[PDB]
Amino acid sequence: AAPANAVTADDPTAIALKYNQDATKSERVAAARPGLPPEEQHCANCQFMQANVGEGDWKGCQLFPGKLINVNGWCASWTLKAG
Ligand code: SF4
């Protein structure tokens, strides 16, 4: 079950960024964002995931203030976690 503040499929920004809480149900291959092969991309290896926000599999994303994403998710702003 998702937290009460999970990003939902109906969120305008989630729709624009093609977020899904499950990267295996995402269009990461179509987008071909740079930095890793697409099949390797998900929130846990993204620069915007906030490891100090949330609990467990439900962590912050800087692009979704006040909400939580799933570490196993993906969106089209995926960017390699570089620091
Ligand atoms: S920006 Fe990164 S951490 Fe945030 S939802 Fe998209 S892939 Fe996940």
Residue numbers in the entry: 1 to 83
Sentences from the paper on this structure:
The refined structure of the oxidized HiPIP contains all 83 residues, one Fe4S4 cluster, three glycerols, five sulfate ions and 160 water molecules. No ferricyanide ions are observed in the electron density map. The largest changes are observed in the Fe−S bonds around Fe1 and Fe2. In addition, the bond lengths of Fe- (Cys-Sγ) for all Fe atoms are also decreased by the oxidation.
High-potential iron-sulfur protein (HiPIP) is a small (~10 kDa) soluble protein functioning as an electron carrier in photosynthetic Gram-negative bacteria.
